[PDB]
């Protein structure tokens, strides 16, 4: 790894895997959980008003 500047591909893929793994933690908690709680509610109101 000490020659990062000679090997841009393996460095950028390293960066991509890391960002991907910690963004998956925030995503799961925030967006996913909120979807599990808010989806039933909006179905029921929206089907009512339709």
């Amino acid at each position: 790894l000490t020659n990062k500047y000679y090997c841009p591909e393996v460095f950028l893929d390293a960066v991509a895997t890391k960002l991907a793994q910690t963004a998956v933690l925030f995503l799961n908690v925030e967006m996913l959980n909120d979807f599990y709680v808010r989806f039933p509610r909006e179905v029921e109101a929206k089907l009512h008003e339709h």
């Binding site: 989806f39 039933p40 179905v43 029921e44 089907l47």
Partner: protein, 50 residues
């Protein structure tokens, strides 16, 4: 009109009997509304989501 009034009143009572009877055998006299079917398939849909 007064003369036909009788046979027409009989025949009306007849066609009310036949419909009623069909309602006993084909639908068990089971009460149904549009909303009820809609509520029941809605809850099925919710279980699947779960």
């Amino acid at each position: 009109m007064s003369s036909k009034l009788n046979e027409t009143t009989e025949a009306i009572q007849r066609e009310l009997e036949e419909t009623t009877y069909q309602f006993k055998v084909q639908y068990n006299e089971q009460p149904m509304s549009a909303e009820s079917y809609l509520a029941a398939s809605l809850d099925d849909f919710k279980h699947q989501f779960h």
